[PDB]
Design a protein around this ligand. Structure first.
Ligand SMILES: C[S@@+](CC[C@H](N)C(=O)[O-])C[C@H]1O[C@@H](n2cnc3c(N)ncnc32)[C@H](O)[C@@H]1O
Ligand SMILES: C[S@@+](CC[C@H](N)C(=O)[O-])C[C@H]1O[C@@H](n2cnc3c(N)ncnc32)[C@H](O)[C@@H]1O
Ligand SMILES: O=c1cc(N2CCOCC2)oc2c(-c3ccccc3)cccc12
Ligand SMILES: O=c1cc(N2CCOCC2)oc2c(-c3ccccc3)cccc12
Ligand SMILES: O=c1cc(N2CCOCC2)oc2c(-c3ccccc3)cccc12
Ligand SMILES: [Cl-]
Ligand SMILES: [Cl-]
Ligand SMILES: [Cl-]
Lengths: 435, 435, 261
């Protein structure tokens, strides 16, 4: 009988599915977490085009398991207390069409035994802090990595050290230390536990997909540490953290990240005429982070080609870059931050800027022209006619320095007088000194 | 002045009796516990026919003490904080007709000094976990035993390990480990502490009385471990636990207990004509347990008589049992589970079944006839004419096996042919093999 | 060293090397969580299951992988040798099946000192033991008849299966059953013992209502030299016409079978 199985629960942690006579007794009503979890279930189910297999770790009285089985999910619920599992099976028996199984088992053993592809979605709500408390942080991170490795998505609600209880003392400094080794993660909500005023963050995590409410796609590789890049078949997703764990970002740096991304979004959604910019496939910002999905460009980053000493055509790289810098300038745009790590080189040795967070609209623009000289020097130090080019620019009154001029003198550099035949000289040492 | 004594309380744990200006400040309102405690006070007072002497251990600000003294109880309240006792006496002085005394003392010392008969009822609400936390579980069990030994009834509210605080870690696995050595105990409610979402069970416990809301009587002995039997002057109370501590019962076993008792109740309240069944004096079931009070039968259990090798008349035991089995069968009833531990033998060597939880109403009934053969063998291996009896039954087509037939062949067994003169033979080895 | 890898899905010792530090060589293992990597058959699998036998399931194959050499006390000399014998035997049966019996096609096979493997076409359905445990609905008529029909066909060609259990039988969606573990196939009062355990099988499958009990009772009346699978199948097909067991003495055989079980 259910009355008996319920009374024997050491704790009525969750709502008893379909049995509201216990809602007043449940530690946690579960409706807020459920609303968020069903939404993420729908997203991933829509993306995969089918009902999902769901794993529920530390599933307690089965509420999220049954509730998802109710929407047509196939669920396995795991808990290490026999009493919790007894209630789960009795509830599944009241719902014989739900495809729902429950097992007494330890989460550590189950994760060691999972096979990639068995489950699309795993949920682990308020369970891992127990494992943290007994096995430590490193083991939990490896468990969580493997859980992300073998599913499409993981949803975690994580207890935090700010909670007032003795076990809080064993928690990482920040719940993100448990998951930051995973590829993709995004805070999706914050929940009241009824134990204290400190809420628990809920995270959506994946080692296989970009899971953004608007764009749900596998990626095949990813790279960095408060910016992440996910590479899919024809996209790059640029993911910025504003809110970072630990001392990582200063107020200042969070705000630059935010500003740079907002700015990249604004530039790319309304590019200037005369400039070829990557198409924007999706974008969004929230308190913790912001993201931008773009069409993916071919080639390698210039910094890589220089580090991994691969062969480069500096004429073609400089000319193509300068041509775009001049086109930009004609429309009243400039790039603050022209560096080898911001430039991509395609197979035909043509270059383009890739980080548009540093695009600005307002002795301008002499400072930028100046650092471009440095850029040129790092790119190589200067042989003729490159040195002749720089020397001609140095002879210009300063109010004439701009990118149209830089480009025009670059295109005629073979006809310009020989710098080493003049005094000359100076400008050599100035640029060399910044570098 | 009371204002002062109250402000000096380290904690306003309870409502200040008669002073509602502090109800907003009290940790616990106490009205829910009080409602339950007054009800149990009334029951026991009605059964003893007089006002009760009540002991209140760790009585804090005196609320339950004063509230019971208000209904005419004589109360002694004990607490080890001077501040709590100061408030208790000032409140008793506002109520000079209440027969109420308060003492600063330790619960451990007070219980060591109690004399049986001084107090009818003791209450210990949310106090013993402190003693558990300092002296351990074994000492607390002995304290609780002695408290049950020297009173008629004890009411305990017990903290549990599921509560979120550091001291929970010192608690038994299950609060019932503190009391299960006591004879009678029954969960009567579950209370919100305002420290957390985990409620505290309240237990009614006795080493002298069956305390069932409908039947409140001394018992003189008791026996077993999820079934208990209390023996009073003309009753047996059969008490079944559905909800047990620890791994004790499986879902399966709780449900059998429930079903068996429900079934015993249904059979005994409407017995078949032609069968003499023990009269039912009271019965009830709830989530944790169920109980049945019956008139008490004379004699000893057959299993005891066999173990303690006391002398038996197998003819009279078998015939009288068979006669009742046949009468039952005629009315469409059978007993699933005819064993020596289910049979009682009176001084005239006549036997009767005592456990009717295994009574059923639907090749039936061959399996039962079969195990009866085993029963017969355990009871003894077979000399003549017993073996001749079994051999005759074995010769019957199976659709004819039933208890009327078993009884009829048993009564004529001295005239039946000699089994050892036939082949014979088999059936000997079959039964011997189950056994 | 296998404790370091046995949690991985697929692993196979491929050699043993001299380190020049000592006379003790170091094993080399090939390990995968995604592919069956057998020198002759190299394919992804999508799931796997058990603990000295492993099963890998790919799109149209099952790979059956037997360990002869196990870590720790796991297998006795005896048990390694049974594993070896059972797999060798499954290979020999399946590569030359009897006419009149439909057997899974063999896609690859091999044995070495540590282990042996067999890749077969994959059958549809669920294992009978699962359907009984996970109490899913079954047609015992169709399961028993189809099984018996194959047991009789086998017997006609001089083959028997030693070990007919729910965990050795697969049931397709049309409730038709087939044997799946052919390591227990034998070629030589035979075959009474097997007929006997089949009675137990029948009982576990359910205890017996009519006409099932009538079927068993008829068999029990047969002189023992007549017990075989052709007979079992023939009496099973006519069980609705056989006399009622409970109208006879009867009786015995009920208790005998019930007692083994
Ligand atoms: C705080 S509750 C959370 C229950 C449920 N996940 C929820 O949030 O609604 C933690 C649950 O995990 C279970 N649990 C804790 N550690 C576990 C482990 N190592 N393996 C399996 N279950 C565990 C406990 O039995 C308990 O039901
Ligand atoms: C949590 S409060 C409960 C008060 C009261 N029984 C109630 O439930 O309303 C525990 C009380 O027990 C008292 N106390 C704790 N340990 C004690 C001991 N060993 N002897 C006497 N009093 C004690 C404390 O002073 C405190 O008033
Ligand atoms: O469109 C892009 C294509 C790439 N390439 C595509 C092939 O993989 C190597 C990187 O990278 C981009 C990056 C980037 C970020 C980190 C490292 C390297 C490149 C930033 C913005 C846009 C792109
Ligand atoms: O009416 C009854 C009388 C007794 N007797 C009465 C004298 O004391 C010995 C037991 O016992 C009963 C038991 C029982 C339970 C445990 C042990 C022994 C008996 C169960 C049900 C009914 C009765
Ligand atoms: O062809 C087969 C198909 C299957 N099925 C196919 C679908 O997955 C469930 C198992 O299983 C087989 C097994 C087996 C081994 C372990 C568990 C269950 C089955 C053994 C031999 C052959 C097969
Ligand atoms: Cl957690
Ligand atoms: Cl307590
Ligand atoms: Cl704490």
């Amino acid at each position: 009988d259910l009355n008996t199985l319920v009374s024997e629960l050491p704790e009525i942690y969750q709502t008893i599915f379909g049995h509201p006579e216990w809602d007043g007794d449940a530690a946690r009503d579960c409706n807020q977490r459920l609303d968020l979890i069903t939404e993420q279930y729908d997203n991933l189910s829509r993306a995969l085009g089918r009902p999902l297999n769901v794993l529920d770790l530390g599933c307690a009285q089965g509420f999220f398991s049954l509730s998802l089985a109710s929407k047509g999910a196939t669920i396995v619920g795991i808990d290490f207390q026999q009493e919790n599992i007894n209630v789960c099976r009795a509830l599944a028996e009241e719902n014989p069409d739900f495809a729902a199984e429950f097992r007494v088992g330890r989460i550590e053993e189950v994760i060691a035994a999972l096979e990639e592809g068995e489950f699309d979605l795993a949920i682990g709500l308020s369970v891992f802090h127990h494992i943290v408390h007994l096995h430590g942080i490193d083991e939990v991170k490896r468990l969580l990595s493997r859980l992300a490795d073998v599913t499409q998505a993981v949803i975690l609600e994580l207890a935090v050290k700010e909670e007032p209880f003795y076990w809080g003392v064993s928690q990482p400094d920040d719940p993100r230390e448990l998951i930051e080794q995973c590829a993709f993660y995004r805070l999706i909500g914050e929940f009241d536990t009824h134990l204290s005023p400190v809420p628990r963050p809920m995270y959506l995590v994946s080692n296989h997909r970009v899971l953004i409410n608007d764009f749900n796609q596998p990626f095949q590789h990813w790279q960095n540490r408060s910016r992440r890049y996910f590479f899919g078949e024809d996209y790059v997703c640029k993911f910025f953290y504003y809110d970072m764990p630990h001392g990582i970002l200063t107020a200042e740096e969070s705000q630059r990240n935010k500003y740079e991304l907002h700015n990249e979004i604004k530039f790319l959604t309304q590019p200037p005429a005369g400039f070829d910019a990557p198409a924007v496939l999706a974008h969004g910002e929230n308190a913790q982070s912001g993201w931008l999905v773009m069409e993916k460009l071919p080639g390698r980053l210039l910094s890589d080609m220089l580090a991994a000493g691969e062969e480069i055509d500096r004429e073609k790289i400089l000319g193509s870059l300068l041509r775009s810098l001049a086109a930009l300038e004609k429309q009243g745009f400039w790039h603050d931050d022209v560096r080898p790590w911001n430039v991509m080189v395609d197979a035909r040795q043509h270059a383009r800027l890739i980080d548009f967070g540093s695009i600005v609209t307002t002795s301008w623009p002499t400072n930028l022209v100046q650092s471009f000289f440095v850029f040129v020097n790092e790119l190589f130090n200067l042989p003729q006619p490159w040195s002749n080019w720089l020397y001609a620019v140095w002879q210009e009154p300063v109010e004439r320095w701009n990118f149209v001029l830089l480009l025009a003198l670059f295109e005629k550099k073979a006809k310009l007088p020989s710098a080493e035949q003049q005094r000359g000289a100076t400008e050599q040492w100035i640029i060399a000194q910044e570098t």
